[PDB]
Protein backbone atom coordinates (compact mmCIF):
# COMPACT_ATOMS: atom_id res chain seq x y z
CA UNK A 1 0.00 0.00 0.00
CA UNK A 2 0.75 3.62 -0.27
CA UNK A 3 0.56 4.25 3.14
CA UNK A 4 3.18 1.18 4.10
CA UNK A 5 5.94 2.99 1.52
CA UNK A 6 5.29 5.99 3.24
CA UNK A 7 6.41 4.36 6.37
CA UNK A 8 9.06 3.19 4.61
CA UNK A 9 10.65 6.01 3.48
CA UNK A 10 9.72 8.10 6.61
CA UNK A 11 12.30 5.17 8.58
CA UNK A 12 15.06 5.82 6.07
CA UNK A 13 15.07 9.47 6.26
CA UNK A 14 13.20 11.10 3.44
CA UNK A 15 11.85 14.34 4.36
CA UNK A 16 8.53 14.58 1.87
CA UNK A 17 4.51 15.89 2.07
CA UNK A 18 2.43 13.02 1.09
CA UNK A 19 0.13 15.77 -0.91
CA UNK A 20 2.97 16.34 -3.13
CA UNK A 21 3.56 12.49 -3.91
CA UNK A 22 2.49 11.37 -7.09
CA UNK A 23 4.09 8.06 -7.10
CA UNK A 24 5.82 5.56 -5.37
CA UNK A 25 7.19 2.06 -5.85
CA UNK A 26 9.74 -0.54 -5.38
CA UNK A 27 12.22 -1.70 -8.36
CA UNK A 28 12.47 -4.68 -8.76
CA UNK A 29 15.88 -4.94 -6.50
CA UNK A 30 13.98 -3.20 -3.56
CA UNK A 31 14.43 0.66 -4.03
CA UNK A 32 11.71 2.42 -3.20
CA UNK A 33 11.49 5.22 -6.08
CA UNK A 34 8.75 7.98 -5.74
CA UNK A 35 7.45 11.02 -7.89
CA UNK A 36 6.66 14.40 -6.66
CA UNK A 37 5.46 17.45 -7.96
CA UNK A 38 8.53 19.52 -7.78
CA UNK A 39 8.83 22.67 -9.87
CA UNK A 40 11.09 23.81 -12.70
CA UNK A 41 14.33 22.44 -11.63
CA UNK A 42 13.16 18.95 -10.33
CA UNK A 43 10.64 16.24 -10.33
CA UNK A 44 7.09 16.47 -12.41
CA UNK A 45 6.81 19.82 -13.19
CA UNK A 46 10.17 19.68 -14.64
CA UNK A 47 9.37 16.60 -16.53
CA UNK A 48 6.24 18.08 -17.84
CA UNK A 49 7.89 22.11 -19.02
CA UNK A 50 10.93 20.18 -20.55
CA UNK A 51 9.35 16.91 -22.31
CA UNK A 52 5.62 17.47 -22.11
CA UNK A 53 5.07 17.74 -25.88
CA UNK A 54 6.49 14.27 -26.12
CA UNK A 55 3.99 12.55 -24.02
CA UNK A 56 1.11 14.50 -26.38
CA UNK A 57 2.32 13.42 -29.48
CA UNK A 58 2.27 9.97 -28.68
CA UNK A 59 -0.75 10.29 -27.02
CA UNK A 60 -0.52 10.08 -23.54
CA UNK A 61 -2.26 12.93 -21.82
CA UNK A 62 -0.45 15.04 -19.11
CA UNK A 63 -2.32 13.46 -16.18
CA UNK A 64 -0.70 10.06 -17.25
CA UNK A 65 2.92 10.96 -17.18
CA UNK A 66 3.56 10.13 -13.26
CA UNK A 67 1.92 6.25 -14.15
CA UNK A 68 3.83 6.12 -17.28
CA UNK A 69 7.23 7.63 -15.78
CA UNK A 70 7.04 5.21 -12.69
CA UNK A 71 6.04 2.36 -14.37
CA UNK A 72 9.22 2.88 -16.86
CA UNK A 73 11.67 3.40 -14.07
CA UNK A 74 10.20 0.69 -10.98
CA UNK A 75 9.79 -2.14 -13.83
CA UNK A 76 11.42 -1.15 -17.42
CA UNK A 77 14.68 -2.40 -18.24
CA UNK A 78 17.81 -0.63 -18.85
CA UNK A 79 18.62 -1.01 -22.29
CA UNK A 80 21.03 2.12 -22.53
CA UNK A 81 21.95 5.39 -21.62
CA UNK A 82 21.74 9.05 -22.49
CA UNK A 83 24.36 11.80 -22.82
CA UNK A 84 27.65 10.06 -23.64
CA UNK A 85 27.00 6.69 -22.80
CA UNK A 86 26.90 6.70 -19.11
CA UNK A 87 24.45 9.57 -18.16
CA UNK A 88 20.46 9.01 -17.63
CA UNK A 89 19.53 5.58 -18.54
CA UNK A 90 17.22 4.53 -21.04
CA UNK A 91 13.86 2.18 -19.82
CA UNK A 92 12.17 -0.26 -22.34
CA UNK A 93 8.67 -0.53 -20.93
CA UNK A 94 5.09 -1.06 -22.12
CA UNK A 95 2.32 1.42 -22.83
CA UNK A 96 -1.08 0.25 -23.79
CA UNK A 97 0.42 -2.84 -24.50
CA UNK A 98 3.32 -0.56 -27.21
CA UNK A 99 6.66 -0.87 -26.59
CA UNK A 100 8.36 2.60 -25.71
CA UNK A 101 12.16 3.83 -24.32
CA UNK A 102 11.78 6.31 -21.38
CA UNK A 103 15.21 7.61 -19.54
CA UNK A 104 14.75 8.82 -16.26
CA UNK A 105 17.46 10.15 -13.93
CA UNK A 106 16.64 9.50 -10.11
CA UNK A 107 17.99 10.55 -7.15
CA UNK A 108 20.14 8.28 -4.27
CA UNK A 109 16.93 9.07 -2.13
CA UNK A 110 14.86 7.68 -4.69
CA UNK A 111 13.27 10.69 -6.21
CA UNK A 112 12.47 11.14 -9.50
CA UNK A 113 14.78 13.93 -11.53
CA UNK A 114 13.96 14.10 -14.61
CA UNK A 115 12.59 12.16 -17.65
CA UNK A 116 11.77 11.98 -20.95
CA UNK A 117 10.94 9.47 -24.22
CA UNK A 118 13.35 8.05 -27.14
CA UNK A 119 12.52 7.03 -30.68
CA UNK B 1 14.02 19.59 -42.58
CA UNK B 2 15.20 19.19 -38.99
CA UNK B 3 14.23 20.59 -35.96
CA UNK B 4 16.70 20.84 -33.22
CA UNK B 5 15.54 21.98 -29.49
CA UNK B 6 18.24 23.15 -27.02
CA UNK B 7 17.84 22.90 -24.36
CA UNK B 8 19.82 21.34 -20.35
CA UNK B 9 18.68 18.30 -18.43
CA UNK B 10 20.51 16.52 -16.07
CA UNK B 11 22.72 13.83 -17.28
CA UNK B 12 21.80 13.89 -21.32
CA UNK B 13 23.01 15.71 -24.12
CA UNK B 14 21.68 19.60 -24.46
CA UNK B 15 20.26 19.17 -28.29
CA UNK B 16 16.97 17.01 -28.71
CA UNK B 17 14.91 15.88 -31.43
CA UNK B 18 11.32 16.94 -31.70
CA UNK B 19 9.71 14.50 -33.46
CA UNK B 20 8.42 10.52 -32.43
CA UNK B 21 11.30 8.87 -34.69
CA UNK B 22 13.53 11.06 -33.45
CA UNK B 23 12.91 11.71 -29.91
CA UNK B 24 15.76 12.08 -27.29
CA UNK B 25 19.13 13.81 -26.64
CA UNK B 26 21.41 14.05 -29.28
CA UNK B 27 25.14 14.33 -29.55
CA UNK B 28 26.55 17.76 -30.51
CA UNK B 29 28.77 15.80 -32.38
CA UNK B 30 26.31 14.03 -34.81
CA UNK B 31 25.85 17.56 -36.39
CA UNK B 32 27.75 19.76 -39.21
CA UNK B 33 29.09 22.34 -36.87
CA UNK B 34 32.11 23.52 -35.51
CA UNK B 35 34.82 21.72 -32.70
CA UNK B 36 34.31 25.04 -30.48
CA UNK B 37 30.93 25.25 -31.08
CA UNK B 38 30.69 21.15 -29.79
CA UNK B 39 32.72 22.57 -27.12
CA UNK B 40 30.50 24.89 -26.01
CA UNK B 41 27.49 23.23 -25.95
CA UNK B 42 29.01 20.02 -23.79
CA UNK B 43 30.45 23.06 -21.34
CA UNK B 44 26.83 24.74 -21.12
CA UNK B 45 25.40 21.43 -20.62
CA UNK B 46 28.18 20.77 -17.91
CA UNK B 47 26.97 23.76 -15.69
CA UNK B 48 23.67 22.89 -15.47
CA UNK B 49 24.61 19.17 -14.34
CA UNK B 50 26.44 21.33 -11.87
CA UNK B 51 23.20 22.71 -9.92
CA UNK B 52 21.74 18.80 -9.27
CA UNK B 53 21.66 17.93 -6.03
CA UNK B 54 22.26 14.22 -6.30
CA UNK B 55 21.10 13.20 -3.12
CA UNK B 56 18.16 15.45 -2.56
CA UNK B 57 17.48 16.55 -5.80
CA UNK B 58 14.58 18.72 -4.57
CA UNK B 59 17.04 20.99 -3.35
CA UNK B 60 18.73 21.52 -6.63
CA UNK B 61 19.48 24.92 -8.17
CA UNK B 62 21.92 27.57 -8.92
CA UNK B 63 23.71 29.38 -6.60
CA UNK B 64 22.22 32.82 -6.92
CA UNK B 65 19.79 34.55 -9.26
CA UNK B 66 22.38 35.81 -11.21
CA UNK B 67 24.15 32.59 -11.74
CA UNK B 68 21.00 30.90 -13.59
CA UNK B 69 20.43 34.41 -15.34
CA UNK B 70 23.72 33.87 -17.13
CA UNK B 71 23.15 30.55 -18.16
CA UNK B 72 19.94 31.66 -19.70
CA UNK B 73 21.60 34.29 -21.36
CA UNK B 74 24.52 32.07 -22.55
CA UNK B 75 21.93 29.41 -24.06
CA UNK B 76 20.28 32.38 -26.20
CA UNK B 77 23.97 33.01 -27.49
CA UNK B 78 24.06 29.00 -28.26
CA UNK B 79 21.23 28.65 -29.82
CA UNK B 80 21.92 31.97 -32.50
CA UNK B 81 25.42 30.04 -33.09
CA UNK B 82 23.68 26.74 -33.48
CA UNK B 83 21.26 28.51 -35.85
CA UNK B 84 24.15 30.04 -37.91
CA UNK B 85 26.41 26.87 -38.38
CA UNK B 86 23.45 24.97 -38.75
CA UNK B 87 22.08 27.12 -41.70
CA UNK B 88 18.51 26.67 -43.12
CA UNK B 89 18.10 22.89 -43.06
CA UNK B 90 17.62 22.91 -39.49
CA UNK B 91 15.63 24.95 -37.27
CA UNK B 92 16.88 25.30 -33.75
CA UNK B 93 14.27 26.25 -30.95
CA UNK B 94 15.64 26.93 -27.64
CA UNK B 95 14.34 26.14 -24.28
CA UNK B 96 15.16 28.96 -22.17
CA UNK B 97 13.40 28.45 -19.01
CA UNK B 98 14.94 26.52 -15.96
Redesign the interface.
Known amino acids: TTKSLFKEMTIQGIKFTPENVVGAAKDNSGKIIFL?K?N????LQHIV???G??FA??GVSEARIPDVVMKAVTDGKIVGY???GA??PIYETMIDGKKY?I?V?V???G?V??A???? | MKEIKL?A?????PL??????????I?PDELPISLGLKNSLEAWAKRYDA????????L??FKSVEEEKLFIDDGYKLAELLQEELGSAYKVIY?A??
Open positions: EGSKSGEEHDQQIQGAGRNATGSNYVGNLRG | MDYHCYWGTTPDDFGDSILNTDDPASGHDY
